[PDB]
């Protein structure tokens, strides 16, 4: 058992609004998600999309070069 | 005897005609479900 010192004040669940917080600070929520995550998102999307587009281009070039 | 002593000695009191009931009605008390936990592992006994 860890020895802890703290004071915790809590309000009853029936004295607070339950759902409005979903839509509060919404620009901050979007901004934090984008600014913290855009590198991770790039590192995930870029190789997949690039490989797919290159494969499509390869297939189109191969199809054209076999025609008459 | 006590009444005579009182009516002779208590002659400087304020005369404001305001009941306590009005003050209570003007600043009512209400109950809020809540808790405060003062955690201290060094105290030998817990009291709640
Ligand atoms: C509805 C509009 C809600 C707007 C609102 O919040 O109140 C007005 C409110 C103004 O007053 P307020 O003080 O802020 O509201 C505080 C509430 O009183 C405080 O209320 P609360 O926060 O504690 O929760 C009460 C809640 C109601 O509680 C719930 O949300 C739960 C509802 C679940 C219902 C499930 C029922 C299922 C069964 C239905 C039975 C049907 C027939 C039976 C069929 C059964 C068959 C088996 O009311 C809502 O907020 C509705 C939320 C809708 C879901 C949001 C989903 C987000 C994604 O306006 C706003 O909060 C901002 C509005 C801005 C637009 C927001 C639009 C969000 C839409 C999503
Ligand atoms: C004041 C004046 C007005 C100001 C406001 C007015 C503007 C907004 C008015 C409209 C409000 C719309 C609803 C509220 C937005 C919202 O949903 O927030 C959630 C969420 C809350 O923030 P969070 O802290 O990240 O929530 C995570 C917590 O863990 C949350 O955990 P929790 O336990 O607290 O809540 C549980 C659950 C609440 O969920 C619900 O309440 C139910 C909502 C109804 C769902 C109905 C389902 C129907 C399905 C059949 C149809 C298909 O989570 C959510 O809050 C929503 C999560 C996404 C909803 C879908 C959940 C289903 C599971 C999805 C995963 C399964 C994926 C399957 C695979 C898909 C991919 C292959 O906000 C966001 O996710 C941000 C992205 C969306 C923002 C859109 C903004 C658009 C631009 C608006 C204007 C911007 C400037 C302002
Ligand atoms: C089939 C399976 C294959 C699909 C797998 C998809 C999900 C795998 C990812 C799970 C790992 C969890 C990562 C996570 O939660 O998201 C990141 C970040 O997520 C991203 O960056 C997502 C990037 C991809 C977005 C989608 C792009 C388009 C598709 C944030 O994690 P934390 O560091 O814990 O952040 C906590 C939150 N806080 C900001 C408050 C600190």
Defining key terms:
part of a larger assembly; 2 chains; A: about 70 residues; mainly alpha; B: about 50 residues; alpha+beta; 2 helices; binds the ligand CCCCCCCCCCCCCCCCCC(=O)O[C@@H](COC(=O)CCCCCCCCCCCCCCC)COP(=O)(O)OCC[N+](C)(C)C; membrane protein; Plant
Compact summary:
Chain A: This is Cytochrome b-c1 complex subunit 8-1, mitochondrial. Chain A has 68 residues and is mostly helical. Helix content of chain A is 59%, strand content 10%.
3D structure, described in words:
The structure is cut from a larger assembly and holds chains A (68 residues) and B (48 residues). Chain A has 68 residues and is mainly alpha-helical. Chain A is 59% helix and 10% strand. Chain A is elongated and about 80 Å long. Chain B is an alpha+beta fold. Chain B is built from two helices and one strand, in the order ααβ. Chain B has helices spanning 2-9, 20-26; one strand spanning 34-40. Chain A binds chain B through residues 1, 3-12, 14-15, and chain B through 32-42. Bound molecules: cardiolipin (2 copies) and the ligand CCCCCCCCCCCCCCCCCC(=O)O[C@@H](COC(=O)CCCCCCCCCCCCCCC)COP(=O)(O)OCC[N+](C)(C)C. The PDB classes it as membrane protein. Keywords: Mitochondria, membrane protein.
């Amino acid at each position: 058992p860890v020895k802890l010192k703290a004071v915790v004040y809590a309000l009853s669940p029936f004295q607070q609004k339950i759902m409005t917080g979903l839509w509060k600070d919404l620009p901050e929520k979007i901004h934090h998600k984008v600014s913290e995550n855009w590198i991770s998102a790039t590192l995930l999307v870029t190789p997949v999309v690039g490989t797919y587009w290159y494969a499509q281009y390869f297939k189109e070039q191969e199809k054209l070069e076999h025609r008459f | 005897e006590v009444v005579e002593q009182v009516k002779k000695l208590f002659t400087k009191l304020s005369s404001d005609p305001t009941t306590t009931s009005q003050l209570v009605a003007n600043e009512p008390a209400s109950f809020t479900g809540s808790e405060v936990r003062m955690i201290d592992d060094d105290l030998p006994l817990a009291q709640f």
